Design a protein around this nucleic acid. Structure first.
Ligand code: ZN
Lengths: 102, 49
RNA sequence: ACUGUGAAGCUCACACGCCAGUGUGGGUGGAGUCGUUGUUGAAAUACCACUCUGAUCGUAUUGGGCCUCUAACCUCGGACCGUAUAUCCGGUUCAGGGACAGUGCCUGGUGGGUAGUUUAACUGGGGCGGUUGCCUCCUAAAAUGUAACGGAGGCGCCCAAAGGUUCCCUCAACCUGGACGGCAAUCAGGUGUUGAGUGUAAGUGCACAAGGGAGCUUGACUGCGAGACGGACAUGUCGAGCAG
RNA sequence: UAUAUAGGCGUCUGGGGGGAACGCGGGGAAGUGAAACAUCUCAGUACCCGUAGGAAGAGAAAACAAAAUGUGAUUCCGUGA
RNA sequence: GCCCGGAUAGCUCAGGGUAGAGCAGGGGAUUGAAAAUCCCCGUGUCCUUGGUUCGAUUCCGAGUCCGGGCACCA
């Protein structure tokens, strides 16, 4: 299917510049930035409900924004991908950061 | 500088109240100490910056 | 996850390849690999999304490097004309260079070629040498202060305890007895009133301990401060006590 | 040299130079002061160039002001200081 | 203050699952002795601390001693 995969613009090599999150949104998971500065979550795909996971996706995004490193330089959220199992593209717009369910 | 100048900031309000000197070879860690904080009005833990 | 808009199995080609085999497309034929697979830090080469390392394709933007062409611009190359006199000047035309060079604005480099200036004081004359601020002692003439290139030294730090508080203790030296052990290590008994020690020079002090040991701890605070010391001035120093 | 132009003839009308001070537009020092000196001052002074007039320059808001229904072109004096 | 580079045996110097190479030093061998050559050794906190990783000389951070160019109006 699909998931929530974001590319945080942070340098994972630096010890200080490490992003770790933990959020809960029913509508306690653990998120760790890869060694190549990527973040992946668990979500559905395009062929699913509309507002069921919209609240779930919004809560997780706020966790990443609140956990942004202080020393991060440049754009923080560069890309978010919701591409299906066989479908290409389907990239979520990174500009949406408040009141997703609308 | 062996003995550099350090500033102690309150844990709660984060105000910088005191400045002193410590040996950074004998005490490699950030100095932790309880000092009076005028803003909070009471003795609070202070930490090096 | 897959297959008849046709799997494997063989064979046809290509690229990588430690030719061990991988990946791509083609054909015959049609009914497959796949989950804990057993070792493993990591399990599936079931598959998917993002991505790293190199390698390669395309469209968009984007910068540099050259070769050309002549029409800008250049020629103290030639020939005519103004012009009777003209190695000036200008114009016409041929021959060459040619978006280079020259010039304007902006910008980095070299720059005694030139210009404006600096290059201390003390001092038994000046130079050479030495010194310049702070702390301690003597000279210093028993209050305070007192000069000389007079006599001796030290400082431009250190300590998170070597600061605060409560409680406890008494050294150095000598004598006597003890396995290595001796003048001197650790043990034991006696005499021992300061001769030891006080982070660091000297002086004044400290055995009542300011010296030795231990438990807790951050007052190495905030707002203030009667009254004084010292002083050309600017500096410097002590302080009971009130509240949090 | 063709269009023509540069140029050449003829004729009218102006210009040139001087002046003590004042005006406008440009170029622009140093001694000196800082108890030295380079930023700074001296000073846009001294001097130099171009120009006028009886005076010159400026002048009729693409202005001040601050919620007041406030002034209302320019120039020059006194305060503001 | 900014940007790069160097530190690895006694000496010089190459290097995510390697500590190595050439000279030195010790014994063995060749030679009639001697020299010149071949064999086998000993030699190492990979500047020092920490981090990522199953695993670091190798990647990252800080610090130490050098070197080069530039910036520096209490
Ligand atoms: Zn506080």
């Amino acid at each position: 299917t699909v998931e929530v995969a974001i590319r945080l613009g942070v340098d994972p090599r630096k010890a200080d510049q490490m992003v770790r999150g933990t959020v809960n949104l029913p509508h306690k998971i653990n998120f760790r930035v890869d060694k190549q500065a990527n973040l992946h979550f668990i979500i559905g795909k395009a062929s699913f409900d509309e507002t069921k996971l919209a609240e779930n996706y919004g809560a997780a995004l706020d966790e990443v924004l609140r956990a942004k490193p202080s020393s991060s330089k440049g754009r923080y959220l560069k890309k978010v991908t919701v591409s299906t199992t066989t479908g290409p593209g389907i990239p979520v717009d990174p500009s949406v950061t408040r009141n997703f369910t609308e | 500088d062996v003995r550099p100048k350090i500033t102690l900031a309150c844990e709660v309000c984060k105000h910088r109240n005191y400045i002193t000197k410590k040996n950074r070879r004998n005490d490699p860690d950030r100095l932790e100490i309880k000092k009076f904080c005028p803003n909070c009005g009471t003795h609070q833990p202070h930490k090096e910056s």
